[PDB]
Write a protein that binds this ligand. Structure first.
Ligand SMILES: [Mg+2]
Lengths: 63, 611, 17
RNA sequence: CCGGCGCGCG
């Protein structure tokens, strides 16, 4: 058959962060791979952590 | 057991002008933000360094420095620039302005507490209406009642001419007044207990007698309920009209500054005069600053774009509560495309070298310094940046026993985030076990996952003892297993356990198989291509009858005259005797059923022996 | 979860001997 | 390091 190679590939999606720059107002880590930002733990992810009862994992990602 | 009591509370309350002053004490007087040339904070402006605190911690508006109280020339404190995030200011309004939330929102609290129709108060505050008899605790001598829309002809010329100017103005604001000042005077001299009693007696009178006969009752119940809450709290009903305007710290407003300018732009104009129109302009400036969009047409800027007020920035899906507080972006987190790893254990995942070295960077620094391979933190970080071959040994060492949290985007239930033991894999993709894909609702056609590292020992213990996949085999919804083989594994098992072809699918003609001592012999014969996966065979059984089969009597019993008889069932043969107690069992099966049974049995036995 | 329920005599007095 | 508009991925 005829198989194509698509733009969506690794080397453009792998991202990592230890620490770094934060927003000026919220003082939270930035948003975006290009800005070396962090991953967001939204409310639906907070619900899952509350479902497990992991109250200390949740406080780490909040403070 | 005595409960570990914890009594913590938070309360909101309407604030007082004295508390606003205590916040600011520090008044913003000029609308200047920065110098057009030097970009320095203008004195007495929205960003004044004396009012709010030192930019570039430990320096004054002049340029002096001290080691981290007040300067003499510019009077700037010697503290950290943290204070610019927390120190408030205030704007001394010449005239009191009502709070938009308590006048224009429906139902109006001010209107219900004063007991006048909302249109009347709106006309009094916005239009050129004057209210008669604003206060009661001071005597009057006139018979003007209500809010006369037209200006009183006598009160314009006659009385001021007869009563002159000074004393007239001294007693002016006691019979006729206008705007938010009249409302604040009415609120200040209210007797709440009299309000409660009058409301109760009017409610009883209405009851002792059918839409608005009820709606008036509900107003009376609402008003006495509203009146009661002021008595037991420390709130004052006149605080719903503002005498001072607190100012947000500059570092939280690096749009809002434009609205703060207009308040100063129109308040400083009003104090120059000291006229009715400018009083209204100050009030509208505060309304737009506090809450735009409630007054019908919301005030726009030069680009015909609606301004954004504090209410807009605290409410909505993108507001402070639902966007900044209920969800946060975190450090020590990564992301990459996920690929399938069928060789992984159920409690393991694969991490790329880059994501792992970023997430565990501080632990790699500690590992470097601990074994004397790095002199300090900077040298260790430089070594990490150079991708030295010893950085990866320390990373692989410190990743052992430290769990990570994986998470797919649409977290619909709690199994959308699970904990795994990371291992270093080549490439740039996250290696995921195939049996945990259903819990994540993940397939390998472009999906990505986020990784998180628990830092404290409590978080690591929580991740290891609560969130690992081997302790979460059941779904909380109904209790069904979540890590069940699917698709390819299910097809493999179905083919393995699909037995012999039988009947007309096995023989062309109407019929008018090897015997194995143990299952290992059958499997060995299968390996040597002696038999197929589904070819029938007889297996000697030396355990109890434990083969699932239809509860049926033997097809045929071969009874010998010596005593032995053979009972032939659909799936097994049983040899019994009357002289002896012997009992032999042979199971008719395939290599596939034997392989499935042996797989499960060996899994159980190996897990038992490993412990 | 894990946050529920708030988570010298006889010295200087020996026998002289 | 702030918001809008447009285009995409799962
Ligand atoms: Mg997919």
């Amino acid at each position: 058959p005829y198989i194509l190679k698509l733009i969506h590939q690794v080397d453009d999606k792998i991202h990592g962060r230890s620490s770094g720059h934060y927003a000026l107002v919220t003082q939270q880590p930035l948003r975006g791979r290009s800005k070396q930002g962090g991953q967001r733990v939204g409310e639906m992810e907070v619900w899952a952590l509350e479902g497990f009862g992991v109250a200390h994992i949740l406080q780490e990602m909040l403070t | 057991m005595i409960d570990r009591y914890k009594h913590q509370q938070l309360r909101i309350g309407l604030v007082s002008p004295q508390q606003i002053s205590a916040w600011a004490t520090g008044e913003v007087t000029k609308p200047y933000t920065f110098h057009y040339k030097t970009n320095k904070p203008e004195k007495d402006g929205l960003f004044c360094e004396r009012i709010f605190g030192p930019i570039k911690s430990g320096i004054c508006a002049c340029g002096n420095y001290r080691v981290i109280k007040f300067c003499e020339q510019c009077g700037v404190e010697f503290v950290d620039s943290r204070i610019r995030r927390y120190q408030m200011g205030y704007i001394k309004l010449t005239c009191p302005v009502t709070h938009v939330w308590y006048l224009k929102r429906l139902p109006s609290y001010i209107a219900n507490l004063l007991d006048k129709p909302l249109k009347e108060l709106e006309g009094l505050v916005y239009c050129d209406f004057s209210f008669a008899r604003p206060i009661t605790k001071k005597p009057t001598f006139l018979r003007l009642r209500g809010s006369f829309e037209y200006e009183i002809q006598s009160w314009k010329y006659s009385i001021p001419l007869f009563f002159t100017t000074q004393g007239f103005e001294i007693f002016r604001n006691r019979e006729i007044s206008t705007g938010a000042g009249a409302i604040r005077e009415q609120l200040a001299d209210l007797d709440l207990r009299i309000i409660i009693e009058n409301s109760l007696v009017e409610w009883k009178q209405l009851g002792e007698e059918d839409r608005k006969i009820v709606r008036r009752k509900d107003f009376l119940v609402r008003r006495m309920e509203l009146a009661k809450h002021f008595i037991r709290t420390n709130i004052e009903p006149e605080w719903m009209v503002l005498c001072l305007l607190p100012v947000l710290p500059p570092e939280l407003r690096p749009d809002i500054n434009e609205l703060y300018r207009r308040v100063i732009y129109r308040n400083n104009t009003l104090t120059d005069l000291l006229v009715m129109c400018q009083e209204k302009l100050v009030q509208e400036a505060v309304d737009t600053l506090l809450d735009n969009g409630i007054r019908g047409q919301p005030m726009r800027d030069g680009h015909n774009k609606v301004y954004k007020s504090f209410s807009d920035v605290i409410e909505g899906k993108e507001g402070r509560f639902r966007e900044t507080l209920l969800g946060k972006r975190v450090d020590y987190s990564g992301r990459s495309v996920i690929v399938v790893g069928p060789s992984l254990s159920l409690h393991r995942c694969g991490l790329p070298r880059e994501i792992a070295i970023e997430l565990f960077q501080t632990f790699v620094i500690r590992g470097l310094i601990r074994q004397h391979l790095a002199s300090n933190i900077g040298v260790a970080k430089s070594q990490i940046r150079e991708k030295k071959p010893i950085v990866w040994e320390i990373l692989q060492e410190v990743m052992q026993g430290h769990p990570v949290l994986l998470n797919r985007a649409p977290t619909l239930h709690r199994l959308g985030i699970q904990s795994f033991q990371p291992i270093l894999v080549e490439g740039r993709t996250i290696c995921l076990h195939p049996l945990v894909c259903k819990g994540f609702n993940a397939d390998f056609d472009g999906d990505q996952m986020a990784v998180h590292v628990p830092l404290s020992l409590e978080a690591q213990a929580e991740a290891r003892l609560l969130m690992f996949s081997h302790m979460n085999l059941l779904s909380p919804a109904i209790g069904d297993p979540i890590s069940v083989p699917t698709q390819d594994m299910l097809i493999g098992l179905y083919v393995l356990t699909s037995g012999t072809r039988r009947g007309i699918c096995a023989n062309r003609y109407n019929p008018c198989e090897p015997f194995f001592c143990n299952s290992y012999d059958a499997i060995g014969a299968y390996r040597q291509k002696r038999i197929n996966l589904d070819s029938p065979l007889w297996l000697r059984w030396q355990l109890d009858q434990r083969v699932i089969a239809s509860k049926e009597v033997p097809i045929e019993v071969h009874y010998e005259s010596f005593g032995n008889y053979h009972e032939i069932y659909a799936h097994y043969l049983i040899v019994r005797s009357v002289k002896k107690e012997t009992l032999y069992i042979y199971i008719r099966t395939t290599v596939g059923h034997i392989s499935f049974y042996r797989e499960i049995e060996e899994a159980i036995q190996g897990f038992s022996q490993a412990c | 979860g894990t946050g529920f329920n708030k988570g010298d005599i006889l010295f200087y007095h020996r026998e002289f001997c």
